Subunit: 191 residues, 2 copies
């Protein structure tokens, strides 16, 4: 057993800490979570690693399927689209991220009506997501992968705030939020 | 031979198009570059893919070493740090990116003195990079990998503008800029 520590924000609100948490939980790895009042930071023995998608990728490389459970798609094109989704969510949609921060997700916080920039960003999210999920599949690529969780978090910034969201995306994001690993993270801030 | 197209901005200034270009060139893949007046976009036969790090990752998965040349480190911890670097550069340092856009790199454009936010961001870059390159190695992990190119681009936003940059980082970024693949991209906009 390697010693594993995941560093979180004190509120357990970071969506990137959520992402790293889910990667760890879905691998079934034993770890301690610690808070800082720079996150997430993974420590495994004498190795340290930051950036939540790099952390998931490392866990998948090091604790490789089929011995440990898989968190990236096996098919290379599905795998590429998973990475595309992770990268896009971290590089785009800044208005949603700024106008709907994750206290809306984890603490029921209410914020202001969307700006013009916020609405345009929300419509871009909806168009992309509807395309990604055009088969109406519960998980992006059939079986769940880490990108489902990240995408659902982004959609839930709107869904859980009460903003109007196409029904199929509500259904997707709500189903993803029932994921056990996600529910276990939510519990950290519920009390 | 699959049909490969890479879509670039019309000026060949995108640092993300540069990154995807370098991944393609360093794999030794045959491709056409096309411009749009959403980039980079990779097309390979009937598959499409966006986000420059996802594109490199796909190329490494699909055109796998040792048959094709390697663009990510073999060691899993070095590989993780490469991904950490790629992810960090795309998610942080926004002031450098905004105050030193890549026309400074590819067209010798001159911009304004750094803001207070810009200087703080530059010092963060310098501290991280000096740490990453503390052995004074020409490439981050010994052998070159795609993260060297991305990191050098970020440093060169400052170096090529004339901003003051620690000598070891100047030396690093200048050496990386001599990479044949990078020189081939530069040629696109030189004329
Ligand atoms: Ca499984
Ligand atoms: Ca396939
Ligand atoms: Ca080589
Ligand atoms: Ca190692």
């Amino acid at each position: 057993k390697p010693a594993i520590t995941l560093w979180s924000d004190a509120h357990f609100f970071s969506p990137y800490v959520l992402s790293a948490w889910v990667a760890l939980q879905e691998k079934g790895l034993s770890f301690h979570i610690k808070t800082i009042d720079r996150v997430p930071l993974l420590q495994i023995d004498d190795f340290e690693l930051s950036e939540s998608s790099a952390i998931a990728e490392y866990l998948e490389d090091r604790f490789a399927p089929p011995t440990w459970e898989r968190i990236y798609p096996l098919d290379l094109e599905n795998r590429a689209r998973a990475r595309q989704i992770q990268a896009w969510l971290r590089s785009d949609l800044m208005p949603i991220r700024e106008e709907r921060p994750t206290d809306v997700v984890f603490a029921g916080a209410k914020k202001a009506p969307l700006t013009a920039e916020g609405k345009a960003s929300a419509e871009k999210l909806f168009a992309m997501a509807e395309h990604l999920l055009v088969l109406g599949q519960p998980n992006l690529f059939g079986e769940w992968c880490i990108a489902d969780t990240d995408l659902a978090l982004m959609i839930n910034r709107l869904v859980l705030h009460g903003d109007e969201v196409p029904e199929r995306l509500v259904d997707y994001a709500t189903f993803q939020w029932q994921r056990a690993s996600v529910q276990r993270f939510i519990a950290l801030s519920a009390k």
